[PDB]
C-alpha cells in the first residue's frame, strides 16, 4: 500500500559470504542487485541488505 521496496535479512550469516551464497550468477537480475550496494549492515541477527 505504501511502496514496492524491500530489505532482505540473511539470518545468522556474515556478509563476506552473501554474493556467493545468493545464486548471483545463476538467478533473475532483480535478485542480483539484492546482494550489493553501499547499504550493507551487519547486525547480530544476520546481515541486512
Amino acid at each position: 500500500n505504501t511502496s514496492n521496496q524491500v530489505a532482505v535479512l540473511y539470518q545468522d550469516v556474515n556478509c563476506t559470504e552473501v554474493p556467493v551464497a545468493i545464486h548471483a550468477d545463476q538467478l533473475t537480475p532483480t535478485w542480483r542487485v539484492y546482494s550489493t550496494g553501499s547499504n550493507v549492515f551487519q547486525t547480530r541477527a544476520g546481515c541486512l541488505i
Binding site: 539470518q11 545468522d12 547480530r44 541477527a45
Partner: protein, 49 residues
C-alpha cells in the same frame, strides 16, 4: 561442539528482541519510580514524596 552438530542439520536459534541491557534499563526505571514516587507513578504522573 554441542551446538555445531545441531547447526549443521537445520536447527538454528534466533536472538531476542530486547537485549539484556535493555531489560536492565527497564527494571532500573521501576526501581527509581518506587523510591522517589511511591505508588503514584503506576496510576498517572509521578508525584514525589
Amino acid at each position: 561442539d554441542l551446538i555445531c552438530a545441531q547447526k549443521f542439520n537445520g536447527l538454528t536459534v534466533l536472538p531476542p528482541l530486547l537485549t539484556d541491557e535493555m531489560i536492565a534499563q527497564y527494571t532500573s526505571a521501576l526501581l527509581a519510580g518506587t523510591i522517589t514516587s511511591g505508588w503514584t507513578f503506576g496510576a498517572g504522573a509521578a508525584l514525589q514524596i
